């Protein structure tokens, strides 16, 4: 029983989907800059325990085709939730509700799926990115720029072609290696012309979870696709902010478990810890169960602590039968 791959017509895309197992569906939604492949350990673990694990490559990523790279407006949170809703209708026709597990920008998508269509989701496991209450004063790009300045990765990703040109002489493999193995709680910085020089390196032994073969899987895909599709998600943040104004004050009503690594940059955004632990998060997400912080772990928890993540998913979703 190997992982099986197929292509599915969804919301104007030809979407690549990996799938393993039979039983109730768990949809796994990857983040940046990742692929379905980031869920490899979880898919095996949950498939072995009687679930059908499905992990697509998102719009602009891997083997999923059809989104115009030159228009970041087509990577809005509304497009992305549209993709997911369409995917579910296509592949989980007889399950009114499915389990969802998501990481990073996937978790951002998943929060909005749950806001827009709670009728589709049975329970949610989100990793790294907590619910963000929409700030009426300004968009997230402006918020983060005001705090961390123009070199902050989100700011540097904004102008089309600028980050792509920065990465071009470096090559996908080195960029991915540097990002995947990053462990410092500061956000990533890409000062113009400096390549990867503003990104500190951790001791090598701390990235032993990533094999060369795993790294090559990612690098091979991104060499082909480039980074534009992925980076366009961040270029859409300003319009996402405008487009989500209808949900000011709305709660996420899906049962949820949130898990984050101690050294994850998003977890160190000013105010985030307070929001997460001191009640704000629970107020917006009333069925949020106790938050989990993984000691000694950074951003890519599914790959860095696969057993801990797989087990946390399993134990949570077992509560619903």
From TrEMBL:
Keywords: Hydrolase
EC number: 3.3.2.10
Recorded catalytic activity of this chain's protein: an epoxide + H2O = an ethanediol; (24S)-24,25-epoxycucurbitadienol + H2O = (24R)-24,25-dihydroxycucurbitadienol
Keyword rRNA processing among UniProt keywords: no
Record-level Gene Ontology MF annotations: epoxide hydrolase activity
Pathway of action: Secondary metabolite biosynthesis; terpenoid biosynthesis
InterPro entries: AB_hydrolase_1 (IPR000073), AB_hydrolase_fold (IPR029058), Epox_hydrolase-like (IPR000639)
Gene3D superfamilies: alpha/beta hydrolase
Recorded superkingdom: Eukaryota
Domain AB hydrolase-1 per the UniProt entry, residue ranges: 24-129
Classification via PANTHER family: EPOXIDE HYDROLASE (PTHR43329)
Family per record: Belongs to the AB hydrolase superfamily. Epoxide hydrolase family.
Function: Epoxide hydrolase involved in the biosynthesis of cucurbitacin and mogroside tetracyclic triterpene natural products (e.g. siamenoside I and mogrosides IV, V and VI). Cucurbitacins have cytotoxic properties and exhibit deterrent taste as a defense barrier against herbivores. Mogrosides are nonsugar highly oxygenated compounds used as high-intensity zero-calorie sweeteners; they also possess pharmacological properties such as regulating immunity, lowering blood sugar and lipid levels, protecting the liver, and acting as antioxidants and antitumor agents.
Name of protein: soluble epoxide hydrolase
Native organism: Solanum tuberosum
